[PDB]
Amino acid sequence: MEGLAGYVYKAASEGKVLTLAALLLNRSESDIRYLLGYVSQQGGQRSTPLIIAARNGHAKVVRLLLEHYRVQTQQTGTVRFDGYVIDGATALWCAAGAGHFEVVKLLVSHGANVNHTTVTNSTPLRAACFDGRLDIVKYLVENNANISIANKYDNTCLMIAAYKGHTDVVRYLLEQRADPNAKAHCGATALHFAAEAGHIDIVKELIKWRAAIVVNGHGMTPLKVAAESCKADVVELLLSHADCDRRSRIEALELLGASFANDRENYDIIKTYHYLYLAMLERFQDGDNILEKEVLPPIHAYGNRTECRNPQELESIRQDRDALHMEGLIVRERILGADNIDVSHPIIYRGAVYADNMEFEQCIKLWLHALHLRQKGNRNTHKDLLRFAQVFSQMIHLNETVKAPDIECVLRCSVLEIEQSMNRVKNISDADVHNAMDNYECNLYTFLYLVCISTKTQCSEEDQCKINKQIYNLIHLDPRTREGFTLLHLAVNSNTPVDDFHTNDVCSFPNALVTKLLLDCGAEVNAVDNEGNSALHIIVQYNRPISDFLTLHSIIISLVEAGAHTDMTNKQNKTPLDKSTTGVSEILLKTQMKMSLKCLAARAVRANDINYQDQIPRTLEEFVGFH
Amino acid sequence: MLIKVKTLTGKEIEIDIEPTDKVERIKERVEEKEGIPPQQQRLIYSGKQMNDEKTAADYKILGGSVLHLVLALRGG
């Protein structure tokens, strides 16, 4: 009976009707309910045959089961849309979500739950306007659908339809007595979603419907969101609201041109100056009632600029391409206060542009400022460290000096970021810790790239001491990957991935310099990984003793100089001499090996399995475990 | 036969030893140009170190090649 259940589920999903009727033909009432209502997993969806028929738009299959076999309309199933997972959605929810009007009309006629809510409080009317089908939206509302019902994020049907490019469902929802003042979890209203997306027609319907613009949970006016979204047309759509005052209008015009100054998709030099020209001109209109901008103090990251407080100052930089990009960052940050989640992106793009123009000092300053502004906000600053390593490797690859305090500043940020990432591994449960573990491993790799960059710089003694102090701090915070690898283990491992983006041409693993610099800073050289391998076990696994012999020799003498126990044995009972796989590496180990009766006695004890616990010194049990 | 053995900084060592010359003193001539004494240049013959007489035919009798030598001290 279970074998036929897969074919019945397949028959409903594939749209075949004659075979489905034949399979269900001559079946008792017990077999009808079991076959129609049994969930099956296919493509990550635990959906009933009726639900998958509505999701796949098989109205005839739905009509056959609903009208004849009397299958329930309240079954709950999990579906997989374009990047979204919805669980507990009935067949009406899937039919409306899939945009199949010929299936929606059949379920409501049989008595489907029009006001059904999924796990994340999702309405079939919300799904219909999410898909953009007006016919399903109009039919569902006329069939007693609650428009005001929102999700767990307090997003109503109008708000989600306001984000997507579906104006027809928005116009019908607005005229169907829908609240335009409903706020999301972060205070975002329907106009907030439209401002970010940039729907001209949708916004015009909202202001006519008494939109009553309000700030969101971040205190961000959606008029300034469009300015922040490089939505030029949307900015000059709400200025005529007759209640936006004067100061707010200045803040919107300043932000829009500044956003145009620093954005990859919406870069233009003519609208950069023009939008800032009118905003400062409107300031210099009353004369005796001047509205002087509260200019932030100049930041060394932004050169020595203090914005433009006069009309003639901005005119002097009308044709200045470097200033217009730089000025846009200052005014945008001054408006935003650097607390927004998107303030750093124009800064990082301007730094990327400067780096792509072989201008390194300015890009380094801007990227450092962006990294500080993101780390103060507790963001996932791992790709930022990765691009820091990439730009430093490109700077040293083009044979130019690197500012050591700038290296110290990013190093000081990396060591503090790792502690935050170390907390993210422990604090976060087994839901996103797999991605957090990858991010923390990437952070360790970026730290290794930074130290490898430091091994090539001139490293003035004060700056070198600062770098060594930062590395000492990180080492004493015991940075360990999921494999048990410390900084030394990865620094002596050729299998540690080096970034291909402008970095693998500079950072080479294993590197004897970084290991040396990791031993002068005091790394625990006898550290054990998950496999029990130390740094000496890992380095002798290197399979390239001819291509780079010195990077295998000058590291080994660097490894066994602080007390790397050459005879210490891994979890799988392998001496590093045993894990040689190379005559050169084993002869180097033999030359560097010094015998000790401690080692011979411990090896003889473990080779005969004499009970030593609670008979030998406590520090000697670990030594026995070494061999 | 002249040698082109690599060193700690990609240098060269002129052994000037034929394939029938034993490596007991052949490494001394190579290290004579570099500076190392005879019983200190623990050279690696592309996988192993020569011991006792160690006629050069053991190391494939290669001409010149690149023999990375170890700087092992106190071996005198």
How close, in Å, is residue B21 to chain A by CA atoms?
23
Would the CB atoms of B44 and A553 count as touching at under 8 Å? no
Surface-to-core class of residue A458, CB atoms within 10 Å of its CB (0-12 exposed, 13-18 middle, 19+ buried): exposed
Surface-to-core class of residue A392, CB atoms within 10 Å of its CB (0-12 exposed, 13-18 middle, 19+ buried): buried
Q: How far is CA A255 from CA A203, A369, A395, A528, in A?
A: 19, 19, 33, 54
Residues of B in contact with A545 (CB under 8 A): 68
Name every residue whose Cβ is closer than 8 Å to that of residue A15 and which is 6 or more positions away in sequence.
A53, A56, A58, A60, A61
Map residue A20 onto helix, strand or coil: helix
How close, in Å, is residue A583 to chain B by CA atoms?
5
Nearest to A208 by CA among A182, A171, A168: A171
Do the Cβ atoms of A91 and A71 come closer than 8 Å? no
Would the CB atoms of A553 and B70 count as touching at under 8 Å? yes
Q: How far is CA A411 from CA A52, A389, A404, A452, in A?
A: 53, 10, 10, 12
A411's tokens = 């190093």
Mutation target to probe the B interface, by most B beta carbons within 10 A, among A544, A546, A547, A549 is A549
Please tell me chain A's helix, strand, coil percentages from 3-state DSSP, rounded to the nearest 5.
Answer: 55, 0, 45
Q: How far apart are CA A371 and CA A265, in angstroms?
A: 22
Would the CB atoms of B42 and A583 count as touching at under 8 Å? no
CB nearest to A587's CB, from B8, B49, B66: B49
Number of residues assigned to chain A:
627
Nearest to A92 by CA among A110, A80, A67, A69: A110
Would the CB atoms of A546 and B70 count as touching at under 8 Å? no
Residues of A in contact with B54 (CB under 8 A): none
CB nearest to B42's CB, from A545, A546, A591: A591
For residue A261, the tally of other CB atoms under 10 A from its CB is 29
By what method was this entry solved? cryo-EM
Would the CB atoms of A591 and B70 count as touching at under 8 Å? yes
Domain span at residue B53 reads 1-74
**Number of domains forming the structure of chain B:** 1
**Which residue shows structure tokens 């411990």?**
A602
- Name the residue in chain A with its Cα closest to that of B10: A550
A335's tokens = 């408006």
Surface-to-core class of residue A286, CB atoms within 10 Å of its CB (0-12 exposed, 13-18 middle, 19+ buried): exposed
Residues of B in contact with A586 (CB under 8 A): none
Q: Please indicate if the annotation marks A325 as binding a ligand.
A: no
Name every residue whose Cβ is closer than 8 Å to that of residue A543 and which is 6 or more positions away in sequence.
A494, A581, A582
Residues of B in contact with A591 (CB under 8 A): 42, 70, 72
- Whether B6 has its CB under 8 Å from any CB of chain A: the answer is yes
CA dihedral A460, A461, A465, A470 (to 10 degrees): 0
Q: Please indicate if the annotation marks A507 as binding a ligand.
A: no
The amino acid that residue A240 corresponds to is: S
Do the Cβ atoms of A563 and A594 come closer than 8 Å? no
Q: How far apart are CA A137 and CA A121, in angstroms?
A: 17
Would the CB atoms of B46 and A546 count as touching at under 8 Å? yes
Q: How far is CA A140 from CA A119, A149, A193, A434, A469, in A?
A: 20, 14, 23, 41, 66
Range A557-567 burial, b when 16+ CB lie within 10 A, else e: ebbbeeebbbb
CB nearest to A584's CB, from B44, B66, B72: B44
Map residue A536 onto helix, strand or coil: helix
- Give the B window 31-50 contacts with A, CB below 8 Å: 42, 44, 46-49
- Whether A546 has its CB under 8 Å from any CB of chain B: the answer is yes
CATH classification of the domain holding B64: 3.10.20.90
CB nearest to B47's CB, from A584, A588, A591: A584
Residues of B in contact with A544 (CB under 8 A): none
The amino acid that residue A465 corresponds to is: C
